[model samples]
Structures are given as structure tokens and as C-alpha cells.
Target chain A: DIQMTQTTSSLSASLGDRVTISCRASQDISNYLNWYQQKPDGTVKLLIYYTSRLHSGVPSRFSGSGSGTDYSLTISNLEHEDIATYFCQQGSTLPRTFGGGTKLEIKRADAAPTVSIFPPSSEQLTSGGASVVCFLNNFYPKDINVKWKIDGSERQNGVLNSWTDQDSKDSTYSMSSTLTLTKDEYERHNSYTCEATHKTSTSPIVKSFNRNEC
Target chain B: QVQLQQSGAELVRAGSSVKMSCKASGYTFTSYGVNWVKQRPGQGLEWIGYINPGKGYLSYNEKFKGKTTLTVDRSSSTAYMQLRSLTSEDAAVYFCARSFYGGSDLAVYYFDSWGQGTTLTVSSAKTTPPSVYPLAPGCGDTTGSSVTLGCLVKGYFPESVTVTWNSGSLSSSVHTFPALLQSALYTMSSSVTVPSSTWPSQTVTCSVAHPASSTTVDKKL
Candidate 1:
């Protein structure tokens, strides 16, 4: 068996995004290659084999085509239901091996709108005294870096939190963040955002919440 | 609707051996080759080997060397595989496989059909007699002042087995019985005649080896 590697360690695409995964074999394996989708629970379903031959009963949207050492598994129309880790395997010889998984994350197009407040909604909460809670929804890739930022200033001294995939339909990661702040330190209403960073894709997705709204 | 009905489970002791059979129905058995596979508990599958009942030729996986043997009785349309020196590691479900043309590397060899696997349990026990017969001389009488030797073996039903003599100093011929008994018996005989000139100098022995059995028997004539 030859070592296989996937180009993208993680990906973020909105619903209906076309996703492509490039898998390179260590040597020329002819067309004896296969692709599989492994669910969070460890059960794997055969997607494609012999480069382009689809296994019986597999959906047509999940297609693969290539030869020799370079192969690609393409999802024509990425849907919410297609959110999972995709991997490739080479069937050319013994000790068949699989490529590192590529996690697909759904990025919603619209951002949440914030409400304006009069008198700046002044609060008695002191800086480094009040704790701000952040919630992330529908994310994949078990490991991620969570952080909190206030007025574009990085707040490193924040507690990181994460949850299980129990409530996630496609087995994605959900996390939360809490930043301690002092009362009456900054303007009454300010913009705060939580961000998660992953190695698969450049740039992190941030979900912002307004303190004045709550 | 071709179905492969395999034999029941077998319990053989360590240092012993066991033979299993897979009987095919609803199709011409000689048209396909029977492949054997080994799947250990919670482990992936391993191809043991395959046998061409039509030609009585076999190919085995290097990993299965000395541990497995494949044979077929074309007469009965049944395939047999025996495992020797049974041990705890040999305790796995064995499956009989069928494929067309023995699947050359170019064509995809799909296991279109398979027999329900039979589990073999290995333990400690006494040795059993080999379920094989000795090789006897085939047929035909010698020329004047010459010696003649012949041997015969039974075959399975619905298929015929061929007996061929190795071309050498002796002259030989082979014959087969078309009709086979349901009890899985068809006879194959071979005979050779050695002229008096060579009979005194060299001894003529008839040797018989089954397509499945590992050992061969030879008798001096």
C-alpha cells in the first residue's frame, strides 16, 4: 500500500458549494483507487472505486475521475446532507491505506443583524469582571481554535469551550467562548465576535453578537 | 439462481486436518472456477486460492502455503478445500467463491456469487486416516514381451475428470466416464506399456494426486 494525502485538511463552503478534493498516491497505482465517506461514528460507505467506477447504489452526485497517481473526488452539488469527512483509498496492493479526511463546513451567507440602542445602553459591568458567552453552530473538524475579540482588539485571556456532536445532524463540532470583562470599562454598546481557526482552509469564520442587544 | 450449498461446521484438533466441500447447483460447474477465502474473527478477508475443475489446475496465495489446498470433482460439480495443521489461528469462517475465467489481471474479478461460509474450530485430538486412495496403474495391456500398468480414481457427478500420462520412455493412453453417480463417483484411468527392452532396466510406478489433496500416491508395477 502507498501513502495517500489529501490537499485540503478542512473546507468551508456554503450550501450548494462545489467541493473538490485532490488525492495523490505515493506511486503509480494505475486506476486501482477508491474513495469513501466515513461518518463520525467510524462506519464508512464506499463512494467510488477503480478511479471512476461508482459502487452499486451510491449517489451519482459523488463522482471521481483520474488515473495513475493523481485522482480527484468531486461533489457536484454540495448539500447540507453531504457534510461529512471524505477520504480516498488505493486498492492497488496489500495494506490498503486511506488519506487524511477533509472536513466540510457549511458557511451561511447572511450575517445576523444587530439592533441600535439609545444612550449606548450603559452597563455597570466592569472590564475583566463580566463574562461574555459565544456560541458556534454547525461546524466540522473536531479540533479548532476559539477566541474572543472586542473592538478589534484580541482578548487572549479568555476561556475556551467545546461540545459533542450529539445535536449535530452531520456530526460537526460546536464550540463556545467566554471572555471575562470589567464593568464600566468601555462604551456601553460594542461589537464582539467569536472566531474559530482550522488548518484546512485559510481565514476563520467569525460569529458576532452585540452586548447591548442582550 | 445458481446457489452454492456448503458443508456444515467442522471441529478439528490441533496438529490435525479438515476438509470442506462446496456443492454448486443451477449452473454448469465446469464453466467457472471455485475460489476459497479465509476471514478471521474481526479481520479482513484473505484469498486462499482457486481451482479450475475443468482443467484440475489450481493457484494458491503465498500466505496460504502449506496451510490450504484446493481441489474439485468435476463429476459432482463440487469443490473441496482442506486445511492442515489446524491451530487456533485457523479458527475462521471459510468461504467458497466463484468467478469466470479465473479473472485475468485486466478484467475485474468480481465475486458475483458466494457460498454461506463454514466455520472450522481447531482443538486437540487424535489423527484421522487420510480420505484418499492409493494410485493404481491406469489401463491397457503391454505388447508382447512387455509389462503393462494402469491406475484409476473416482470423480464427482455431472462432470468428467481427465487422466494424462507423462510422455516418457513408456507409451500411455487415458479414458473418462461421462455419467457420474450422485454419490460423487466417476472413474479416471490411465495405462502405459513398456517394451521388454526398458521394463527390466527401469521400474514403472503409477502415481495419482487429487486436485484437492496435498499428498500423492505411487505404486511400483
Candidate 2:
């Protein structure tokens, strides 16, 4: 049996949107590639076979291609019934190998923003106090949460948050939160943490800054 | 939906002659033409010739003119190729690809569909090494606020390979897909993601460790 590989764990696509899932074989399997979709109830159906040949009863919207060890399954027009986890199986040799499945998810408007933390500059530290900035950029839907923590405890005081009224260059949102500290506090604190949560993310993205590293 | 199912593997003696066949299905066999391609073991695809079963018209690559003859059995929707004076150089996995009319002039438009290749072996054996290509420039997919950069690793054999990403402090976000087989080689892809705020200044690298080649290949973005 040859090893098969599928890259994406989940793909987001909308109705009528074209989507593709790919799989690779560990050895030269010729064109013995097949694609199947598993429904929510666990029933499995073959969608394509022999690389590009549509299986019986399969819709024309689904197509396939590739030779040797690389192959792909594409949905020309996505539909509600198309929701399922797709798998690629290699039948070129014995021990039939299958790829890791790719689950097709409905596309949503919200996009998760990336989070980063920038510690106080040397000049700011020399001025007798310091401030650390936690930047959240290019998020969609505009609703987000940003929080600050010091030494594992929540710190709400001396924190300021601001965001652009309109979208960023990419049409996503950008926001930042800054935490200020007195000279004594800046020197005494060991770790600073910034947490950002958005609708598209499963949980908050935590970025940490170490005062000693700065 | 068109399919070109070709004949299977064959082993012939050096200096002998061999004929291969491809059967067209799910379309009008006479309207669109069939083409032949040669891929020497462990080599890239090379176009040889094409034949229109309807008109009995044809063309050949100058390099293959004398070496190959293309013919068709319209009644059976089957295309054939006969290779003469066969040598070690003619040993390859030959493919039957589909095409149609060209613009203006009477020509075939595209090689859109392909037959699972026929492995014509004059003489062959042994585990082969993969041809690792340079990584494509990492272009981030800024779908959401997060950016994804992809690295494609292809055309390797022996299957065992390790794909790793280096993104300074953000390497944990890397996702590497399994190696896929095409023709007779293996290919795989790996991707890394970072926040849009750190994208422009960050450099990420994808490295492939192939034990068969006993070498490592790296590409960066």
C-alpha cells in the first residue's frame, strides 16, 4: 500500500463557488485514483474513478485529473447537498491507500485577524516609563475582544484600546490596545500577555511579551 | 466527463517493435483527436503525435516521425501507436491524450483529457530517485486577516520525505500535506500562516528532507 496525503483539514466554500481537494500517492500509482464523499451519517459514495471518469449517478459538477502520483477532485458548482468530507483513494496497487479527508465548510463573511505584541522601545524605557502595544489587524465583521494580562492575572487599569472606524486596505478591520506602566512597574513585571478573540476563531489568540527579552 | 482508457503494461526486447492502444469513451471519438506522449522512466512528458480518427489526418513531432506511427480504428473508437526499431531510449510510459480543433487553421485545440498511461518497458527495474523542483514563490492567501504561504514539493520517489517550515516564531502554524503520486513520482505541499501584521516583514522557509536522494531542498518566502 502506498501512503496518500491530503493537505487541508477543512475548506470553506460557498454555494456556487468552485472548490478543489487534492491528494498525493507515495509511489507511482499510474491513474488509479478515486474520489469519494462521506455524508454526515457515514454513508460513502464514489464520486470519481480512474482519475477523471465520473462515477455512475455522480453529478457533472464533480471532475478529476492528474497522472502518476498527484491527483485532484474539483467541484465545478457547489451545492448544499455537497457538504461532506471528501477522501481520495489510490487503487493502482495492492493494499489500497486512502488520503486524509478534507471537510468542506460553508464560507462565512467573518475572517480571523492575526495578533502580535510589540514591547516598549529602549527609548520609551529610558524615559522613566514604558508601554506595550498589542496589534490586531485585518479582522472581518469588526467585532473583536482584546484583553491584557500580567503574570497570569488580568490587568485592566492603564490599558487603552482604539481601532480604525473603517476597514483596512484589505477591507478587514484593524485595532490595537496599549498598556502603559510606571517605571517601577515596568521593571518589576516579568511577562505581558495580549489576548484577541474573533468570530472566526475557536478561541483567543494569545501573544506574549517578556520584559527581560526587551 | 470524457475518458481515454489505454492499454496496459508491455515488455519488449531491445531492437524489437511494439504497438499500444487507447480506447476513447463518453464522447464522439471521431470529432476530437487523440495524441500520444512519451515519458522516459523518471522523466518529463514529451508530445509525440496526434491522429484524427474521423478524417484520418495526423501530425508528428519531428523527433518521433520515424520512430512512431499513429493510427485509429474509428469503428472501435480506439487509437494506436506502433514504435519501430525500439531501443532503450524508447522505453517509457506512453500516454494517450485528447484534443480538438485549432483556431483559424485546421488544427487540434487542446490536450484536455488523458488515458492512464501504458508502461512500455524495453528494459527496466530498480527504485528511482525523485526530481525535487524549486519551491514556488510563497504568495500568501489573505482570505481572512491571517495569511497563508504555500510550498509545493514534487516529483520525488521512495515516498519517505520530511517537509518542515521555518517562520521564526510562528512555525507552529505550519501544515504539510502528504506526498502524492503523479506518473511515477511523488509530490507534496506544505503551508505556513502568520498574522497580516507580521506578514510583510516575516520570512518563512520550507525544507524537504529526502533520504533516497540523501539531500535537502529549501525554498523561502
Candidate 3:
């Protein structure tokens, strides 16, 4: 495997600053180059590969293009959640190799603040002695907390699970939590909510549903 | 229904050698070259090399040179790879991968399919030893978060190794280290994490093995 390097020791930019990282393979690896983002805890997210093909579910802002020994991974408009280390990889041969990675820190600037979230809301639901399932959609930073609430009281009644998209950098993530609820609890509770929390964002996204309707 | 069914598990003595096979079915084996892969316990996929069943030509990952030999029997529609001087580090799962090309660039060329894999064990050939480690997870994420995955591994000595991941639905990438350590045994690991939205609860695997052994191990997390 050949060692890949990224140009620009460090890049400084504002929130809307368009950033680019140039990656060159040690040899002509063709168009087998890929990119990724790694969190502090070793959790890695794949961003781009095969030079320009974007993995499904990634945001349009994160894009890659280039060929031969030279390649590039670009992020159009940076978001607060975009702060992380990015890497480039080559899939042309065995023992595929990756670049060390580039750190993208949100640069504070004098400009209009970008819109962050849509809204904050919640709901409740109950399972009449059946399995209750909830799905979390479009989130980042894999680690999130999910639970059940009964009449404003926390209830440990469900199992939480998560899924991700093909492209790691995209704000596309999903999860499911399942639990059993008693008929009484199910009838008394009007609905249930699936909530997701992350360090990058201040509030979480909650998806709620009415079990009675189902 | 084209499939590459691999041989059964194998056990070899330290300093001894062994060879494994992958039998092709439902397809013209000679039409495509067989790619050889190695995966160890808790490690990633490594491409040891590949062989053209029709031309009898071969290409190997530089790190697998001398440690692995690629050959095939066109009449039987079977491909084989041999490894020499087995040691504890040689204990790993070996897989016979079929690719479109018979050259070194076969991996990045895009592999359309794979085999179920054959496990290889390297132990004292004479003494019957218990299975060292229980079946661990294949070498990737299990959360089903993303589809794209990546993995890497390193060992004590230079052994025949290969790392591979599913790239059809999910984009995959791999990297190998140069032969630096000249010790009896080495350490290597492979890792891959997919997005959660694509597959939630699906399993991705990373494996490493000596091409010549009969048993290989994988970790799926």
C-alpha cells in the first residue's frame, strides 16, 4: 500500500468558507481514491470513493472529484456539525491505504448565521401488550440516547438501535427502538417519541406517533 | 447462481505447509480469474494474490510474495493457493475470490461476487489442538448505519494476507503495510464503519489469513 498525503498543513476559513483537501497517491492508483471522517473515539465515516462517486445518503455539500495520482475532497458550505478529521484512501490495490486526515474546524466569522434546525416538538404513544417500534431519521455522530416516557415519567421499556448511510459525511442516519407496553400503559399514553442527541447540535430531533391510531 | 464454493477448514504444523482450494460452480470458471484473500481473527481483509485459470498467469500483493503461490485447474474449475512455513501467525481464514482480471489491479477492478470462505488453522500438524478462538464477528460494523466501509491489518512477519469488503451496495477500501518486522509472529487489524441509514443491524466483515492455511478468522462489529 502507498502512503497518501493531503496538501495544506492547516486551512482557516469561516462558517461558509468553501474548503478543499488535495490528496495525491504515491503512484497512479487510477480512480480508486476514497475519503472519510474519523471522530475522536475511532468511529470512522466514509465520505467519497472511486474519485467522484458519492455514497448514498450523504449531503450534497460534501463532494469529491479528481483522478490518477491527484485527487480532492471538497465540502461546499461548512456546518457546525462538520467539525472533524477527514481522510483520503486508495482502493486500487490490496492493503488499501489512507491519508493521515485533515481537521475541519468551524471558523467563526462576521456573517449571517446559517439555519440549524427545523423545530422542536414531542409526542407520546403506548403499545397494547405489543412491541412498539420507533425510527430515528437524518442524524449524525452515531452515539445517541433513546428511551420511553410514560406520562412525563421516564420508562426503561425499549431497545434502541441505529443505522447509517453509504456516505459517512452526509447528515443521513437512521435508528430504531422497540419495546413492549402493557395494554393499560398503552391506552393511557396517547403517543411515543424517538429522540436523538449529539455533541455537534444543541437540541435533538424527535419523531413521535400515536399508537391509538395504529 | 454463479458461486465460488471454498474448501473446508485445515490445520498445519508449525514449519509445515498447506494448500487450499475454491471450486467454482454455475459459471465458467475460466472466464474470470480467481482472487485469493486472507483474513485473521479480529483483523481485516487482505488480498494475497490472484490467478487466471485459463492462462495460468498470477499476480500477488508485494507483501504476500514468497509466502503464497497461486495456481488453478481449469478442468476441475478449481483454484488453489499454497503457503509455506506455518506458525501461530499463519492461523487465519483463507478465501478464494473470483475477479474479472488476472492481474495485480484485479481488486480495484471491481469484484462482482465471492465465496462462503474456508477456514484454515496453523498448529502443530501432529498434535490435535482445540479450536483456538470461538467464531468472532466478521471484520466490520454490525449497526447497519452506513454502507461504505474500510479496514487495515499488520502482522509480525511477512505472511500471505488479503483484506476485502463488500463494495456492490456499499463502497469499500483497504490498505496494507510493508514487510518491516522480521519476527516469528506479527499483529494486524482491519476495520470498517458504514452509515446507519443504509443498513441498521446488518453485518459487515473484515478478515485476515495466510493464503496457505485451512482456517481463517473474522471480526464483525
Candidate 4:
């Protein structure tokens, strides 16, 4: 199978931004490079067919160019709905080969997360176990790392990280991670810490909960 | 109930700039910030940037950093974004949405209300006058700790123009390139570098001298 290579795996774009995603063929493919756009909802549509020809119903802003073994797809005046993965296919060979998809995501705002910790309540502890939930709020882009620590050491077991929740009013995201502890371990541990790491922050946000406060 | 009323469509020439207005009504304008978004034909949505009306602070997407400038008229509750140095790629539908800033930093939480979109078309530059785009902090070719502010002079005929950068005094670090022919028109670029420490408290200006049109244009950032 002839390989089609795409140099960039992912790129960030904005509206009215001009971007090019290139695809190189392993051998001479003439003008058989076809570009396709796959939306976030898994719908794939043909954008350009036969190297540089625009597909029917495609707008003029999207164009394909190149020849021989190297070809490229260019989009001018990009729009928000254009967030999707793009793939280039070579049709001149017996076994058609497609380049790895290039995912295009909208560049979002940057803001640090504010973290808070809620320890297991007395009622939650009465069930013979403790569930401590750490809330990470007001973060953008939704990429965050959370860890649970016991007495300054890392704890891996029984830690559940929930999906990020988007606030309906403000659009910022909030996520909660639960650290479960049995009655014996909960009483033995005097301090528990929730460490949150996000790209916006220079240092991880660490908030601790002390059992002595109860 | 909150409503954002944006201006109508605009058809500007290539190499020029156009400012669109978003007039806020039905709520306290100073309570929330305004966000600008763009959508091309048959395309998805993209957030250009946001502006805090009360604080008069602004932030933009990296791609749109030098291409757009945002401001507000507090007296009339109007938020504006000037799209600059336009080409065919800059043709799109612009929208202004109201942002909910929940916290102290005035960061955008969500866009609750959006105005009806305004379509912009960039026409031929043969007969258009020159427009200047003065870049902000994060724009242009930045080297080390020094910030380079770039100015784009575009869409005039006759191909002869003079560009000068001004700070407190005339900037000596200016580099003005030769005007290049585009679509039978002319476009030129000039940049000046300044110390990062000095840029914060300084005002930058790019003035143009177009002898063919016998007019001068000044843009400040």
C-alpha cells in the first residue's frame, strides 16, 4: 500500500485564518489526491477531488493544489464550523492509502483554574467509608490533571475523576474528583491533599483537607 | 432580557479596514463584557476575541491578535472591533455576543446573548486608499524579550508611500520594506522593536504618507 503522509497531526485555527494541510504521496500519483473533511459528529464529506478540483457545492474558500506525488489542501477565511479532522486519499493505487487525519480545533481562551476541596462529611463517614471530592472550577480548554494524596504521598487506588461540567451561565468548566477511603484509613490519615495541574497555571493548585478540622 | 444589536453588512476594498459596531440594550452594559465571533460562508463559528466594557480591557485569539482591534463606547453602550488589513480570507460574518464574567479576573465564562451576524465582503483594491494596522504586544516578529510592533500599509495605487513609527520620540528601530504589487495594487509592511519593559507604558503610532492620494493616515495602539 502506498503511504500518504501528513506532517502535522493537529493544529489550532481561528475564524478568517488561512491554513494549509499538506499530504505527500509515496510515489507518482498524478492528480488523484482527494481531500475530505470529517466533522466532530463523525460525518465525512468530500471537499476536493482530483488534486485541485473543488467538489460540487464546496465554497471557493476551500481549494486543493499540487501535482505528482505532493499535494496540499488550503482553506482561506476559515470558519468556526470548520473544526474537524481532514484526510487526504490517493486513488491512483490498487490499495488506496489515506493520510493520518489532521485535527483542527478552535483556539480557546486561557484562564487558570481555582480549586477547592470538600472532605467527606460526618454523614458520609457514618456509612463506614469516606468520599472526599475535590472541585476544580473556572478553567478553560478542559484539560486538567488531578491527583489525590495522603500525608503528602500519592494515592492511586479508589480515585474517581469525573467528567468536566460546563457551567450553563458562564461557560467555564468545573470538574470533581472523588477520593474514597475506608473508615480505618480515613481516621488514620490526618491530612489529605488534592493536586490540580492545568496548562494555564505555572504551578499546580494544591488544597489540603485536615481530619482534625472535623 | 439582554439584546445585542450589531451593525449591518459592510463591503470594503481589499487592503483596507472596517469597524463594526455592537450596540447593547435591555440590560446593564457595564455589567458584562462583549465577545466577537466570526463565521465564513458554509463554515463553523470562531471566537475572535473579547472586550471588557467596564474595565476597557481586551483579549484576542492569537490568530486574530494583529488582525483585529476591540474597543467600547461607554456612553452609548456600544462595543466595536476594527478588522484590519483584510484580504479575501477576511470575508466573513462577524457577530458580537455578551460574555458572562463570573470572577475577579474578568475572564469570559460564557456568551449568553448573540447579535444577528454582519456579513463583510472585501472588494478589489484598485481604487481604495491605504489603511494602517498597528499591531499589539503579541503580534509581529518578536525577538527575545523585545516586542516588535508591525504596521501594514495596503491597497493604494501608484506604489509610492512612506511609513513611520512613533513612540515617545521617533522610533529609530524601524524597518520599512519595499511596497509589493498584489492584484495590481500595492502593499507594504514596517515594524519597530521596543524593550518589553518600555512597551507597557508607551503609546505606539504608525503614520502613513501617500502622495498619490495626498492624504495622511495615522493609527495608534
Candidate 5:
């Protein structure tokens, strides 16, 4: 019964607002908390791990606090591009759990900028999937378009991508999206592309993964 | 039709000596050389050494130089490798393979045929040199002014051992016999008879060699 859930879905915070997203656990998790942000393009970035330790290059203000079962992720002096979704994960137990995520939108619009598939596996002659991560980093303005497709067909459900709107110096942002496909899909030899369209470019930045490449 | 029949498994104490046999049949005894290769014990197939039974010439891999001595008995058509001062590291099944030479040192090869393996098991044993006890060589007069020096030794076990006698440095007529004690230990005796005129200044001395152990006694008679 170690489930994690958040009460809030979305919050309207101004650029100067000090925003805090709270997360609760069904049982005591001993502060095994972590925080991540999902930019518009669906890139999930890990901001804090082991509760309070900020990941390298993440802003100091985005600190994690709380002990035992209650924890919160705070952003001090939120910037305009801080408008994005945030998720809380508790790694204290097996069957790891995460909250519904906090959607921190600008009182109007606008936010900051930010945000791979993965690993070596046994040769899959029969059927199995490659655990993948669609990753990108260091973009600005908090908005981007992320799409994962097999031969151009978009996959909507069963995706794991989170985000971060600020870096250690508060200069850039980054995140990673994950989608596990059937080995059949990998064996299909189809084009599994990580396509991102950011305001910084006129055309979408597309990177891809293939089966034989493994 | 050349083939090698390897000896059965051997169990020995660490820091001991093990002599393995590989009998060859179906071919001319002196036509080709036989090579020894270590095949197991987690080290993979490692070249140990090779011997030309005809000429009695042999070559050893640098790593196994002192660790092994290779020899052959043309009469028995068998190749023997004495793995001396054995240790856990020397515990491995060995193979004797048919060797072919290709004109030069670097081109010489040793892997056409192999003796089924002979396993050398070196169990835990005292690492200290096997104690050698040699009775004061019997330096006694046999002929007028001529003397016979005898050295009777016992107490060498587990480790490889040998004995020698030199009368004042000149090689003399010597008779040596090594017998296994009831306790499975080795007892070697060497007697050298020298004409009084031929004895060197250093006098008759008996020497025991355990590869890594010692001895010297009979000053003179």
C-alpha cells in the first residue's frame, strides 16, 4: 500500500510566485523523494534525487523538503518559462510510484526552456522490447513538440517522459521521454524517431533509434 | 595412426613433485616431437613445452621454464614431464600433442595430435623445503690409500629431491640408489670410490639437492 498521489493537478503562478508542489505517500517512505518536470514536448527531467539533493546543473531554489511520508518540491522566484508539468516520485519501495504531477502554468502563457531511449539487451531472436528513453537537453522558453512514432504512427499511451524548466545557473532546461515498445515493434525494423520542435528552430530536431543498431 | 595415451589423475601435496606419463603408439618413435600443453584449471590452453624424442632436444615456454622438466623414454615410447615444486597453481590436466616443425624457431608448431589429458592434482601440503637427512658419508679405506665415500640419506617427502657426491671436485665412479620408505618418503644413497691419487684438495663431500633444499657432510676420511 505504498502509493504516491498529489492533491493538485494545475496551479496558476505568476513569474515571481514561489510555487510549491506537494506529494503524499500511502505509508512512510522515509523521504525517498525525487522531483522532475515535464516540458511542453513531454520531456521528463530529473531535478532532485534522494529527496533534497539537486541533480547537477539544476537550480538551487528547486529544493526538495519534508521527512517521513510528506514531501514537497519548491521553486523560488519562478521565471516566466517555469510554466510546465512537474512530477513527484518515491523510490522507497518496489513497484515505484509517482503522483499525478503538478501542471505549473503561467498566469497567461510562456515558460522556460529545457530538456534518450536506452540499453544493451540479450539478442532477441523471438520477441521482446528494448527499454528506450527519448532524451534531449539544454533548450529554452519551456515549450517544444515531442513525438515518438513507428513509421509515422503516433503512440499516445504508455509513455514515460518528464521535465525541468531550470538549470543550476537557471540558464537552460532539459528532460527525457521514455516509451517501451514490443520487441516485435523493434524487430519490425521500423523507424522509431524522437522528434522535437522547439521555438529556437524553424524545423523539428529529429533523432531516431533502430533495432539492428542494438 | 599416431596416438598418445595419457596417465590417470594424480593427487599430490602442494610444493611437491608430480611426474606424468603419456605413452605413444602406432608411429616411429623418433619421427616427430611431442608437445605438452596445459588445458584446464581456468587458465585455458597454455603451451608448456616440447621435446624431440630422437635427439632429446627440448624447449620450454618462458613461464614454465623451471616449473617443468620434459623427457622421453625411447624404449617405452613415452614422454614424461616432471612438474616440480608443485603448488595449487600447477593443478591442471595436461595434454601431449604431436608437434611439427616448420623450418624456424618461430614457425615450430605443436598441435596436430594430443594425448588424452593427464590431470595433476596438487593438494595442500607443507610449502617449506622437505627436510633432508644424510648420514655422514662413509669415507673409508677400500684399497691401500684409496677410499670409498658413502652417503645414506632419508627424510625428503612431497618435494622433488636429488643427491650428488664429488671427491674434492673430480668426478669419480659413483653408485646411487633411491628407495621409497614405508612412509612413502624417499631415501637416496650415493657412494663414490676414489683412488687416493685422484682425490681433490676439497676432500670427499656428499651433496643433497631438493631443488630448493640442501646438505653437505663427510669432510674427509
Candidate 6:
């Protein structure tokens, strides 16, 4: 049977903490594979599929890596939400299977820095390199935390930027984290997660780009 | 414009059977193969099997062999999946799908269409594992000393999984194969060619994983 042998069971992180998970296939079904995220709300969406292509509107932080039997899905910049589970499926063959669901949570442990995962329809702009953007809005004590995770590993290379919007519409202030992975073979198919924290929050906000093909 | 309209959901008793239909319209009736897929609640999609209406040829996933049966009605341009030995694990949404396989050899032009999904429910059942054909996966030399090991995975539900090769510090190359649906089942295979140098241990390993399950099967030859 087509199967995705899950590498990990769960990924627990705080805002700005990078998270990642992986799987191995039982056969070389070619690059005909895909990755998906099952939200806590029971909504399942396509993250990265067919090896390297991201489903339209999927977050850019979401990236997939490895070809053949080896594959991984990374989400950079943990959104202010808990990713119920991340899975990998084969798209190239007939009836496909998925990896054991991986749990992703902000762990909202210490402090008041909790957040939520972002909704679907996450990214679009892409000229070169993978761009990860995390958006946090509507909150007091505008002081927020942020970081980027590449393939489950956190890298301090990119910068996290936050600011107010035009008109009083910006009154509440919004925090957005943007990071670009250098164009390289390794960068082509890797998972990226957005880790973010806030003052009034208790759950870490996590967002992921399942497949970083750009 | 080939459209697949599937039947309603089915709730069957354990040990019983349920048959669902997918009627095709728009495109020529018997020109292509009609495949089926299964998706459990909140679970990922799995390729069940397919039926080539034109040739009336049916193939099965080795695991689904005794569990699933396929049928087609050319006059109605319809395909069907009959799942038996029902269990709670059998409760899932089944959909009919089709793709373009044309010219020369049956080259997959990429699956293109799917039918509205039909959900099936059964009570009390354990999760079923896949059946790797050939039971024992091993490798042999194609020429002098160098060897190649290939594993044929059959009758696994869901069309998602991959093959990897290991030789205990030995390197190898993967000669991959496409997962094909025959007799209403899927056949997937892949192998590694190792040179004499790496054959030191003379042992080859085939590692199979079901991503959705924490379990991984490693067999050595």
C-alpha cells in the first residue's frame, strides 16, 4: 500500500519557534507526492503537493523537501495557532496515504505570549527565494514576539518586521514577520514555520509554508 | 468534459458489503479507466483501485484483493467499487476518479477528474496494514558481484507511500516505478543497484513506512 512513514509525532513550539516534521515512503513513487495540514477545526487543506509545487494561496513559509522516497514539510514563522497535524501523501500514484499526523502547538506555556495559527490563502508574491510572512493583528500591549523556523530548525538569519497600517485603520497596529531563504537546491523543497508570540496571548501563533519551491 | 457523479453514502454492518457507483458523462464512455479513492473522516486520501472500461480490465491493490471488488457498466458509462468485510476502519468516503492514459505505452498524462465522494460507515474494526507482495524483499546481482534489490508493494490502500534502499553503509541508486492499478489494485516497485564494493555485507534492506502510522517495516535480504 502507498504509505507515508511519519518521522515525528508532534512539534510543540512557542510564538516565533520554528517547527518541522518528515516522512518516508514505502516505494519510490517518483516525485508524485503531496503534503497537507489538518487544522484543529477539522479543516484539511493542501500545503505542498507533487513534490515541490505549493497549492495556490498556500503560505509561502510552507515548503517541502527531498524527492523520491525522502520528503519533509516545513512551516516557518509559527502563526498564533496550533497546527493539529501535518501530513504527507503521494500524488503521483493511485490511492495515496499520509504520514502519521504531527501535532504543532504554540505550547503557550510561560508568559502571556499566546497566538493562533493563520488561516488558509497565505501567500502569492514570489520573484525568487522563499518569502515567509506572519501577520498578527488586533491586540493591546503591541509588544509581540517573532522568529522563523526552517525545516523545523530555527535560523536567526532573516528579519521580523512589525508596524502600523495607513489611516487609523492602522490604529490597532499589526505585526508581520518576513524572511527569505537564499535560492539554492536545499531551499527549493524545505518546510518553513512562523513562530510568533504576543503580550495578551496564551497560545503561540504558528504559520507554516508546507512546500518552499519558489 | 468527463464528469463522475457518485452515489449516496453507505452505512453497512461489519462483515457485510457495500457497493457504490460512479457514472461518467461528457467524454467518450469506454475510452478511459475509472479509478476509485477513499478518504476517511479528517483523514488523507487513499487510492483504492481502478477499472479500465475500454478493456474491461480490472486490477486491485493486493491488500484490497479480498476486501474490494470492481465492476463497470459500459452502456451506462459507470464504474463501481464493492468493499466487503466491513469494519469501523472501513468507514470512509469513497470517490470515483479518472485520468488520461494515452498513446504508445500507458503513460499517465496525469489524473484529471474525480466524482463527488460517498461516505461509508462500519462499526468496530482495527486499522489494516498494507500487504507487501513477495513477502521477502531481497536483492540479487544483475552482473558481476554488483547487485540490485527491488521490492514490490501490492494491495496497500491509499496511493501514497515510497520506497527506500539501505545497505548498511553501502550506497545504491533507486530505479523507481509507477504505481499501477490492475485487477482493481495498485502495484508499486523500486530497486537499488549496488556495486561489488558496497556489497560487503552482501545484505540489502527495504524500508517501508506508512506515514499515517508510526510503524515502519524494515526487512533485510
On DockQ, the leading prediction is 3
Candidate No. with top lDDT: 4
Q: What is the lDDT of every predicted structure here? A: 0.58, 0.68, 0.54, 0.70, 0.61, 0.58
Q: Per-residue alpha-carbon lDDT of model 4 for A1-214, expressed as tens digits? A: 5678888877767669998998998898878777777666433556777787775677898999988988888989888767788878665653345677787766557867656555555544565666565656567766788998889889977775544333334435655465767878888888888899898877888877677755
- Residue A73 Cα positional deviation in candidate 5, in Å, after optimal superposition: 59
How large a fraction of the reference contact set does each model reproduce? Answer: 0.00, 0.00, 0.07, 0.00, 0.00, 0.07
CAPRI quality band, candidate 6: incorrect
Cα-based lDDT at residue A50, candidate 2: 73
Candidate 2 overall lDDT versus native: 0.68
- What tens-digit string does per-residue lDDT give for candidate 3 at B1-221? 56777788775568888888888888887778776766564343456776766665767778778878888778888888788877778777776655544344424433445676677666542321111111121222123333433232323233445554443223332222222222333323222335555433566665545544443545343
Regions more than 4 Å wrong, model 6: A1-3, A12-19, A26-30, A36-49, A55-61, A76-85, A91-98, A103-214, B1-6, B23-34, B39-45, B52-56, B73-78, B85-89, B95-116, B123-221
Which candidate, 2 or 3, has the higher lDDT? 2
Q: What is the TM-score of chain B in candidate 3?
A: 0.54
Q: What is candidate 6's local distance difference test score? A: 0.58
- Output the worst ten-in-a-row residue range by lDDT, candidate 6 chain A: A116-125
Output the better candidate (2/4) by DockQ: 2
Name the TM-score of candidate 2. 0.31
Instruction: List A-chain TM-scores for all predictions.
Output: 0.58, 0.56, 0.48, 0.74, 0.50, 0.48
lDDT accuracy of residue B31 in candidate 2: 80
Clashing pairs in 4: A80-B44, A80-B45, A81-B44, A81-B45, A170-B109, A170-B110
Q: Write the per-residue lDDT of candidate 5 for residues A33-83, one digit (tens) a residue.
A: 766665654234567766787766787768898888888889999986567
Candidate 5 chain A, poorest ten consecutive residues by summed lDDT: A111-120
For each candidate, what is chain B's TM-score? 0.54, 0.53, 0.54, 0.54, 0.53, 0.52
| Candidate 1 chain A worst ten-residue window by lDDT | A113-122
Candidate 5: where are CA atoms >4 Å away? A1-214, B101-104, B108-110, B125-221
RMSD for each model, in Å, please?
34.2, 19.2, 17.9, 24.8, 38.8, 24.7
